[PDB]
Design a protein around this ligand. Sequence first.
Ligand SMILES: [Zn+2]
Lengths: 397, 397, 397, 133, 50
Amino acid sequence: MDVLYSLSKTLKDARDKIVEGTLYSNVSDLIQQFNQMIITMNGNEFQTGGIGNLPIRNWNFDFGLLGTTLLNLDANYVETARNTIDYFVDFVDNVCMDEMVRESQRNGIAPQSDSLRKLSGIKFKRINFDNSSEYIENWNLQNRRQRTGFTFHKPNIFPYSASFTLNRSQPAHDNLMGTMWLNAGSEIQVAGFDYSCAINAPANIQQFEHIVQLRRVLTTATITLLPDAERFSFPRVINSADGATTWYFNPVILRPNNVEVEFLLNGQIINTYQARFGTIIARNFDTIRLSFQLMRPPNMTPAVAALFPNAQPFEHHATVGLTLRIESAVCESVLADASKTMLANVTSVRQEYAIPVGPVFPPGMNWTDLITNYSPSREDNLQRVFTVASIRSMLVK
Amino acid sequence: MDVLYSLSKTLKDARDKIVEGTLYSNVSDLIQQFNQMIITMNGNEFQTGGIGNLPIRNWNFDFGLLGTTLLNLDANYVETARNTIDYFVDFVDNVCMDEMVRESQRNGIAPQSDSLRKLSGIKFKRINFDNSSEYIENWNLQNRRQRTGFTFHKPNIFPYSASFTLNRSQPAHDNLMGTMWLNAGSEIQVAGFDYSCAINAPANIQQFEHIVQLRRVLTTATITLLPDAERFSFPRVINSADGATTWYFNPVILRPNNVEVEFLLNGQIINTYQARFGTIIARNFDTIRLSFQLMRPPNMTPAVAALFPNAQPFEHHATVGLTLRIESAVCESVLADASKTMLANVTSVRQEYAIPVGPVFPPGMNWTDLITNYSPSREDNLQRVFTVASIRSMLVK
Amino acid sequence: MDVLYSLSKTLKDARDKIVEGTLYSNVSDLIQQFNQMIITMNGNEFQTGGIGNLPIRNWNFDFGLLGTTLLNLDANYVETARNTIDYFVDFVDNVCMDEMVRESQRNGIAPQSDSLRKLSGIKFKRINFDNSSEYIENWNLQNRRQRTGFTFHKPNIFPYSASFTLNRSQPAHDNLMGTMWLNAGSEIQVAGFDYSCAINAPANIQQFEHIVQLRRVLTTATITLLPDAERFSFPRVINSADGATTWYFNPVILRPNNVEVEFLLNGQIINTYQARFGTIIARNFDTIRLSFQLMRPPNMTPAVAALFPNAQPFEHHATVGLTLRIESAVCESVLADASKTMLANVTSVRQEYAIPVGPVFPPGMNWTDLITNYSPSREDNLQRVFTVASIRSMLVK
Amino acid sequence: MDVLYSLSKTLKDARDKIVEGTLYSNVSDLIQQFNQMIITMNGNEFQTGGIGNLPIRNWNFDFGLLGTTLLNLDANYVETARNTIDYFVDFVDNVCMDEMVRESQRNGIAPQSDSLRKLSGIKFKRINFDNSS
Amino acid sequence: LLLKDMAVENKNSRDAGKVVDSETAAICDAIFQDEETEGVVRRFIAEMRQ
Ligand SMILES: [Zn+2]
């Protein structure tokens, strides 16, 4: 595999450092590496494709080396080179794609394609070099067993979940108490509502709580926590839990009281914040617990008092909420986020070539389904497949 | 042009790899490249500025080479070097800026300034080197007429558009049906409203649709799709279509029914998603079509039933909506996005030097105006100008 | 200090370019640099830790070098090398962490730890090399007293602030006029409300204004400006200014009239935009001023007219708002943003090792507190500490 | 059959007793046995599968002996060895599985697969060893 | 360079041994006999064939 990597950085640092006008010596160390390749290759033949709509093209090698007597390249030098590169580019593309579609439950962490299986062969190792591309960097460190780690902006850790839980309800749905939320991507919005405005509640306070369990631990997370859940601050007509009817939600928002956010790891509180809105750091956690309360206002102007009567009908529904967004974080496992194109690359190549659903990934590489049941097999396959996508993007975007 | 590039990576990899200490051997390959430059330059004379409030400055060259002697680097070596670099820095800055202001209809792609036009000369080509900077990388591939491509976080593809369309209206605006939306940057929010809650509609369902045509195709897009349009979930007083009066919008939100998102390319459906909220991939498209419905709730608790009478006045306006955000995508054309400073750099240099409006770009480099009428000339000029901004940011931020 | 840097890029470019197979002549220039180090070190003793829950591990040096010889690398070569690297890694980690906790009122910009103070020594300078990591790049340019600069996506310039100002109020809070806002991170949302809908106001227009003073100047900012403040578009029960009671806010939204955004620098208007929504550029500013008005609709349909009576009670509260988001910008001072992990790294190391509160940073490295009173000492310490975090992340994530 | 057995204890006592570090003479008696194998093999082509969803895989043999030298086994020695073992492992697996599914009435105790039938051949017996399992 | 052109007999040991060069040779025969050299030494010297 690592083999593969090189092939590219070779070409990139090539299609880049090899231009009409640079002094030879700026590529002396490079040129070499290159040739070395051609050699090892020539002779051996390859097969790519052979699945879904993916074409089966046959590649063969027969190339002459490169210069050695030059001083600042002449145009002619380039063109005779570029012609050779273009065959490798169009090659790798086909190589990546071919191994970017196969999946395997048993050993879905190793090479699948006839193309790559042949590369892991020993007679090729002679190429590997400059492993600085963040992904390969972590691919190695994992083969030896050590502390990996990636960087993500607005990580996609929460499978889509939009629902509610009625802690107090009745057929008419005219005096409910519970929570409703939206967990998606890197964001959580949760609202706690009490139609009675805690009129009969101890200390006139209703407690709420929202717990979210991550499928993977996030470390070094920079998080924005804000009071209120705008998403649940407007009038709604919602389906009942049993789907038999619809209820009316007419919120009026109050500040969440006694806000406490806990970032836990294996049941232990690692970070805890009491009513701290703005930017907070959660250094290592697999669970987020948001606790907040609705406290009936002890003093009310007439306009406010009018919204909260001592007896039903309760027409204005007291609501308190929180919004939490993970701006950035580090994860030991690959994940989709708001900046990297890996998931999109893998999903796109599979869609374009009409690749049949396999035994590992959910239909369409669906993110929610994937992260919901993020098994070891799916993660190993995802990492292999993401690393290949990153190798491909060095040359083909 | 490519020439220009080098000049910088030369300086960067210079002001970076050259310091009090290190071994010669780590820069041997570098030092050379450098000198090579000085030579080609010396003797030549330049001129930058002259437009608007931009100062005119002349530059000459007559500099000593570099001691290719020592085994290590002594402080003294650096200082005698840094002194020479600083003249080039202050130079390039003035060079960039001077070519970052001029526009041109006929050939808005090639160089403009007396400064650069002279560089494209053959006698200077003896300086190109290490073109791994994403932008130049793509500048070349476009000359050779091949498949380019850039990477963007929250791209800026949608010109600002905030409006509505009343499909059913009357003077009193007391029983409207239509849609309202906000397309801006990488986001779309659209709501469909029916004051009558589909009371007289076939199957008690009102169909809605929102189509957005991109000015450029986006590939590899990672997209967040969520139900509801929070922006259109609150009470509003809006101006009538003819501007003669104002209407009242008092929404109550229901879940969008039969949601279907289609990402089309030249009229063909490339990706289609039915009621799938969360993260979805759109691999290649120039158009987005969002179709959704408002279905009158077949079963209603009293509180809900009360909002939707059989006869006017209709006081609670049934509304369904969708929110779509393009987190990342690839485009073959340069665009502004939420992370890159290119647009801001170009716009800022022009504003600071009071550069007069030209024949190509809209006043103030206005993004909405630019993307709305993204002509080939504007794109070629934008790419030239963005590539220069990126060359400049390697040294001056 | 710069010393430190090298130590890493040494290891990275090492644990990266040294793999079973690669051709020697790709590392010739590298190998050297490496050895050079071992030498300078051997014969030196260090000590890290001693504070809070940070272990006190001791280190010594005495190592053999590396054959330079061999066309290609044999597995055996690596392993005998990796064994030596791992001691340096586990070293640096402890070195970073030890200097990443101490703060000094006086010279919070200079080295602290017994470990590093010893490195700034002259006899170690013989190790410097390849300073291209954005942070160190700027560390130097500053030490020389020159123009710095960084890059941030969704910078964190606004300390959390969520409040209101009642310009007209009375005990019953039944006819208020004022503004409410949320400044946090890179975003500002502000709403102006007038319960009377400007019924007795000159020209039936109520003027509003919101001013935000940045603690540091931002240049090259790409900004999204949109009409409406969704956060303040829903019903709320709010505490009175004196905390003695609660008032009711029942907004109905109208388009903000005569919107004018000014980006000022030292009291001077640098950029001004009149009613321009979408993407705008603010090239250099330390203050943002948003002015907008509520204009009573001159023509109203019955439904609208009904919301705005000539006499109290005023039950629907006319509200106009704006939303402004700084997507990206450059700052001469380090700041937290939505992508970089620096703040989180520093905060996390301190939390994990139970580092006691010091004399410079607020408890918990609280961002709001830090940016609110961003003194020169806090900035120098923050930069030192952020630069170290970035050096560490090259090897340990 | 017994043949088969060896193939493994060979590999186990191999992937086990052969590691970065060990002194020479702890593999002398072993090393030998190993090589002896490679020889007998090289040249003969094999075939596994062909039934149900069992992939028809082709196997070929052409591996160099060993550097019966170095004192305290250098890392490099191992890796060049492990690479050869892994082909045999992935082999045997396929060999076992292929004969672990065929049934025969008349004479059901004997070997079935084209893979194994070929092993019971005399020219291979030169391998059997350590039947303590 | 080539080695056959430097071949030499490792006087001691069972498998016809031909070591690198003269010095290589000397040393072996030399140590072989310094009785205070771990049993592993003779062994290695021994069996190690070209
Ligand atoms: Zn963002």
